[PDB]
Amino acid sequence: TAEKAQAIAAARNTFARDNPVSAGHHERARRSMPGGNTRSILFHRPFPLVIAQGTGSRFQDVDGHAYVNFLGEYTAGLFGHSHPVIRAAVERALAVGLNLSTQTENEALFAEAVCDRFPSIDLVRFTNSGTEANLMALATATAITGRKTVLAFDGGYHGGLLNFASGHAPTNAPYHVVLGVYNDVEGTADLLKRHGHDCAAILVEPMLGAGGCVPAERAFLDLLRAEASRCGALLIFDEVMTSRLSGGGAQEMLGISADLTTLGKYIGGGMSFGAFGGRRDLMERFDPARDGAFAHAGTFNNNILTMSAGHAALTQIYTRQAASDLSASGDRFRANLNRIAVENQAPLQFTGLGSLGTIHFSRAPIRSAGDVRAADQQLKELFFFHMLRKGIYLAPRGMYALSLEIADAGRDAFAEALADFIGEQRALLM
Amino acid sequence: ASDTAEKAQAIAAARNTFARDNPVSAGHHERARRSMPGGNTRSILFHRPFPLVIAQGTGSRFQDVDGHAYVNFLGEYTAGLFGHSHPVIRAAVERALAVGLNLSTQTENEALFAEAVCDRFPSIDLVRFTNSGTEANLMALATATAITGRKTVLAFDGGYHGGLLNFASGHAPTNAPYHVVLGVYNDVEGTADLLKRHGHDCAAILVEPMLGAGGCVPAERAFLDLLRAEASRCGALLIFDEVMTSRLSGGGAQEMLGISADLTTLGKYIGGGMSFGAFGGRRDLMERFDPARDGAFAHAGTFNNNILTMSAGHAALTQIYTRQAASDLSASGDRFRANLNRIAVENQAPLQFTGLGSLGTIHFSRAPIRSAGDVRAADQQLKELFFFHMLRKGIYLAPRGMYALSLEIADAGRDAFAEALADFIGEQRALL
Numbered sequence: 001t002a003e004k005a006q007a008i009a010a011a012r013n014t015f016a017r018d019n020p021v022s023a024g025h026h027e028r029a030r031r032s033m034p035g036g037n038t039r040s041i042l043f044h045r046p047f048p049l050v051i052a053q054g055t056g057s058r059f060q061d062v063d064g065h066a067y068v069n070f071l072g073e074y075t076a077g078l079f080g081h082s083h084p085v086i087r088a089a090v091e092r093a094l095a096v097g098l099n100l101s102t103q104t105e106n107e108a109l110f111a112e113a114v115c116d117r118f119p120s121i122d123l124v125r126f127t128n129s130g131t132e133a134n135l136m137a138l139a140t141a142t143a144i145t146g147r148k149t150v151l152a153f154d155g156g157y158h159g160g161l162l163n164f165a166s167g168h169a170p171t172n173a174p175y176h177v178v179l180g181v182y183n184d185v186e187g188t189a190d191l192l193k194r195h196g197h198d199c200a201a202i203l204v205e206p207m208l209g210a211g212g213c214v215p216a217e218r219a220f221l222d223l224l225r226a227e228a229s230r231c232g233a234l235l236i237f238d239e240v241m242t243s244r245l246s247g248g249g250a251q252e253m254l255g256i257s258a259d260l261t262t263l264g265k266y267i268g269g270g271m272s273f274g275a276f277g278g279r280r281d282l283m284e285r286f287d288p289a290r291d292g293a294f295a296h297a298g299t300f301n302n303n304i305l306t307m308s309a310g311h312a313a314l315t316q317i318y319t320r321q322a323a324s325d326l327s328a329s330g331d332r333f334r335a336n337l338n339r340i341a342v343e344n345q346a347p348l349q350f351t352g353l354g355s356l357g358t359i360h361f362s363r364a365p366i367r368s369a370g371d372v373r374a375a376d377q378q379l380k381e382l383f384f385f386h387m388l389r390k391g392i393y394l395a396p397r398g399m400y401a402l403s404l405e406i407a408d409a410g411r412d413a414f415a416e417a418l419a420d421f422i423g424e425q426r427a428l429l430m
Numbered sequence: 431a432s433d434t435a436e437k438a439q440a441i442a443a444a445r446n447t448f449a450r451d452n453p454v455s456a457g458h459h460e461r462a463r464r465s466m467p468g469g470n471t472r473s474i475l476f477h478r479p480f481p482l483v484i485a486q487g488t489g490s491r492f493q494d495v496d497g498h499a500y501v502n503f504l505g506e507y508t509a510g511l512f513g514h515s516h517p518v519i520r521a522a523v524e525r526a527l528a529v530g531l532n533l534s535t536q537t538e539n540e541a542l543f544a545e546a547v548c549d550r551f552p553s554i555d556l557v558r559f560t561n562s563g564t565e566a567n568l569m570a571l572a573t574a575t576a577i578t579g580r581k582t583v584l585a586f587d588g589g590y591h592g593g594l595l596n597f598a599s600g601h602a603p604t605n606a607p608y609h610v611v612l613g614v615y616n617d618v619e620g621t622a623d624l625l626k627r628h629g630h631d632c633a634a635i636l637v638e639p640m641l642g643a644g645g646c647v648p649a650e651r652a653f654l655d656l657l658r659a660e661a662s663r664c665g666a667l668l669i670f671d672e673v674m675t676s677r678l679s680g681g682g683a684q685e686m687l688g689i690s691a692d693l694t695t696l697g698k699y700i701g702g703g704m705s706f707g708a709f710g711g712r713r714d715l716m717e718r719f720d721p722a723r724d725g726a727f728a729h730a731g732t733f734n735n736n737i738l739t740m741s742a743g744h745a746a747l748t749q750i751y752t753r754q755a756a757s758d759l760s761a762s763g764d765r766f767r768a769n770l771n772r773i774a775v776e777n778q779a780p781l782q783f784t785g786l787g788s789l790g791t792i793h794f795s796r797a798p799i800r801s802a803g804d805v806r807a808a809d810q811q812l813k814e815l816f817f818f819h820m821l822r823k824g825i826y827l828a829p830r831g832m833y834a835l836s837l838e839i840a841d842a843g844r845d846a847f848a849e850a851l852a853d854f855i856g857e858q859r860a861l862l
C-alpha cells in the first residue's frame with residue numbers, strides 16, 4: 001500500500017538524518033567497491049550503518065549511536081566483540097608464529113574437538129568459509145557417485161556460489177541443480193522419482209537460515225534420508241548455521257544422520273572458517289596418501305588463528321552445556337516475543353530454533369520460501385528502522401542470533417522495543 | 431627422464447633417514463590420522479613418509495617438534511611474505527582486536543583496504559574481497575558467465591585456480607562443472623585453433639601470468655597478446671589469476687607486461703597473511719555487484735570484510751610491501767635465481783630454476799620449460815631427493831621445489847641455499 005510506502009519513506013529519511021557520517025562513508029566507499037559494498041547482505045537503503053567500535057554485546061556507529069548487537073555476525077559472532085578467551089587464543093597463535101607454512105599440532109587438536117562434538121562427522125577437513133565447505137561437499141558427492149544432479153530447495157542458501165534464496169542465481173556455480181519446495185513432502189517425492197537415478201546429492205539446511213529461520217519438519221527430513229539411501233545419493237546437511245543448536249547440532253536433536261555435514265560461522269572462534277566432514281569412507285577419499293586421492297589444498301585452511309581460536313571456542317567457551325543453555329535461553333526469548341505479539345493481536349510472529357529467530361509479518365504457517373515471501377515485506381523494513389531507533393541492531397531482514405554476551409537487560413530492551421513497535425505502528429498493523 | 435631403481439633406492443634411504451630424524455612428527459601424524467583424512471586438511475602439505483610438524487617460528491626461521499631449525503624459503507606458498515612474526519602485522523592485529531571482532535556491519539577499514547588495492551593494481555577500478563583465491567576465481571567465473579550468458583571457459587593444462595578449479599594434472603573430477611576447455615600453456619598456434627573453435631561461446635579466458643603450482647613457468651608475451659586480442663575479439667572476459675603473480679611488481683604482472691585483463695583475481699600475502707582473496711577489474715563489469723542496482727549480482731560471505739584481514743591487509747600494502755618494496759624484492763629474487771642457475775651451468779648440472787622476481791622452482795631438465803608437458807617431463811625423483819637434501823641442510827622449501835622469498839630472507843639464508851645447492855650437485859653427482 002501507499003500508506004506503508006510513505007511510512008518507509010519517512011523511516012528512511014529519519015535514518016538518513018540520524019546518520020550523516022555513515023552517509024559520507026558510503027559516498028566514499030562507492031569509489032573503491034561496487035555500491036560501496038563487499039558483502040551484499042550488509043547493504044540496505046538508503047545506505048548501511050558504518051560501525052566504529054564494539055565491546056561485548058555492544059557497538060557504536062560512526063555518528064556515535066550505541067546499540068546492542070542482536071545480529072551476532074549472522075550467527076558467527078557467538079562470542080561478542082571482545083571475548084577474553086578468543087583474545088588469549090589470538091595472543092597464543094601470534095606467539096606460535098604466523099604463516100608457518102607447514103603441518104601444525106593445533107589443526108589436529110581442533111579436528112579432534114570437531115569430530116568429538118558432531119555425531120555423524122567421523123573425519124573432517126577445514127575450509128575458509130561455509131561457501132567452500134558446501135562446494136567441497138558437492139565436489140565429493142559428484143566425484144564419488146559420477147552423477148550430475150543436485151536436489152536443493154528454494155529459499156536455501158549455501159554460500160556465494162550456491163545461493164537459492166530467490167531461486168536460481170545467475171552467478172551460481174553451474175551444478176545441475178533441481179529446486180524443490182522446502183517442507184513439501186509430496187512435491188519433493190515427485191522430484192526424487194524423476195531425478196533420483198541421477199542425483200549425486202541432496203543438499204539441505206535443517207532450518208532455512210538466510211531464508212527466514214524456517215525449521216525443517218520431521219516428515220520432510222525423513223523423506224530426504226530414506227530417498228537418498230534408496231537412490232544412492234549423498235545426503236548433505238548444511239549445518240553452517242544450525243550446528244550451534246546443540247553440542248552435536250541439529251543431527252543430535254533429530255536422530256537423523258547425513259552422509260556429509262558442512263560447518264561454518266562460530267566454530268573457528270570468529271576467525272575465517274568452514275568445514276566439511278562426514279562418514280569415514282567418504283572422507284578417506286581425501287587422504288592424500290591414497291590411490292587417486294581427491295585434491296583439497298587451500299592457503300588458509302589450517303591457519304594458526306582459526307585452529308587456535310576454534311579449539312578454544314569448542315573446548316573452553318561454547319561447550320555442549322553452553323550450547324544447551326543458550327538454546328534454552330533462546331527458546332524462552334522467542335516464546336516471550338511471540339506471547340507479546342499474541343497478547344497484542346499483532347499480525348507478526350518469530351520463527352526459528354534455539355538462539356536463532358526471524359520476524360515474519362504473518363500469522364499464517366511459515367513453512368517454505370513461498371510463505372516467507374508472502375508475509376508483509378514493508379512492515380519488515382519498518383521494523384528494522386524502529387529497532388535501530390531503540391538502540392537494538394538486528395538484520396535488515398529481521399533475523400537475530402543471540403550471542404553468549406546477550407544478557408537480561410538486552411533481552412528485556414528487545415521485548416520492550418517490540419511492544420513499542422506494536423503500539424507506535426498500530427495504524428499500519430490493521 | 432624416467433624413473434630408475436637407483437634413484438628410488440636413494441629416495442627410500444632419504445625417507446628412512448627423515449623418519450628416523452623426526453620421531454615426534456611421526457607420532458603426530460598417527461594421531462592426526464584419527465580426525466582428518468590421512469591426518470591432512472590441505473593436500474599440498476602432505477608428503478611421504480609424513481610431513482614435519484613445526485613447533486614455532488620467528489622471522490624467516492622455524493623449528494619442528496623434533497628440535498630442528500630451518501630457514502623458511504617456502505613462505506606459505508607465497509602468502510608468507512612477512513615472516514612468522516612481523517611487528518607491523520602484529521600491530522595491525524592488536525588494532526583490530528581493539529576495534530572489535532565480528533562487528534556484523536560495514537566498517538571504514540574495508541573501504542580503506544579497497545582503496546589501497548585500487549591504488550596498487552592498474553587494471554582494478556573496483557574490487558570485492560573474498561576469503562580465498564579459490565573464492566576469488568569462482569566469483570570471477572561467476573561474473574563472466576552471468577554477464578556474457580555463455581558457458582565455455584578456456585583455461586590451461588598445468589593451471590591452478592583453487593580447490594574447485596584445479597588443472598595442475600588436467601581435469602580434476604572434483605572441479606566445479608564449468609564447461610572448461612584446456613589449452614597448452616604458451617602454445618600460440620594450438621590456442622589460436624581452440625579459440626577459433628570455441629571463441630563464440632567463450633565466457634572467459636582464465637590464465638595465470640606465470641604457472642604457480644604448475645612450476646613457476648613464465649607466460650611468454652606472444653601467448654598473452656593472443657589471449658588479450660582474442661578475448662576482445664570474441665567478447666570473452668580475460669581473467670588474469672594474479673593470486674601468486676601480483677607480488678612481482680607494484681602493479682603485478684599486468685604492470686610489467688603493459689597488458690590489462692578485464693578481471694584480476696588476488697590472494698596470498700595481500701591480506702597481511704590473514705585469510706584473503708579478491709576479485710576486481712573494469713568498472714563497468716564490477717558495477718554489476720552494486721546492491722542498489724535492479725538485478726544486482728549477489729555476493730555475501732561471512733568473513734569477506736572481517737576486521738583482521740581489512741586491518742593487516744591495509745598495513746601490508748601501505749606500510750610494509752610498498753610498490754618500491756615489490757620492485758626491490760623482485761630484483762633481489764632475480765639476482766638469486768640467476769646465481770642458482772649460474773651454479774647449475776658451471777657444474778654442468780641437468781637442472782635449472784624457473785620463475786620471476788622472488789618466485790622460483792627447480793626442474794631437473796636441460797630443456798626450455800614452457801608448458802606443463804615440460805614440467806612433467808623433468809626428473810621427478812631427483813626433485814624428491816632435492817627436497818630431503820635441503821631439509822638436512824636446514825633449508826625448508828616446497829616438496830615440489832618451489833621457493834617464495836619473504837621480506838625476512840637475508841644474505842645468510844640466500845648464501846646457505848646456494849651452498850646447499852652446490853653440496854647437492856657434488857653429493858649426488860652419480861645420479862646426475
Ligand SMILES: Cc1ncc(COP(=O)(O)O)c(CNOCC(=O)O)c1O
Binds near residue numbers: 131
Ligand atoms: C546455511 C549456510 N550455508 C552456507 C553459508 C555460507 O557461509 P560463508 O558466508 O562463510 O561462505 C551461510 C551463511 N552465509 O552468510 C553470508 C554472510 O554473512 O555474508 C549459511 O547460512
Ligand SMILES: Cc1ncc(COP(=O)(O)O)c(CNOCC(=O)O)c1O
Binds near residue numbers: 297506671706
Ligand atoms: C595461482 C593461484 N590461484 C588460486 C589459488 C587458490 O588460492 P587459495 O588457496 O587461497 O584458495 C592459488 C594457490 N592455492 O594455494 C594452495 C595452498 O597453498 O594450499 C594459486 O596459486
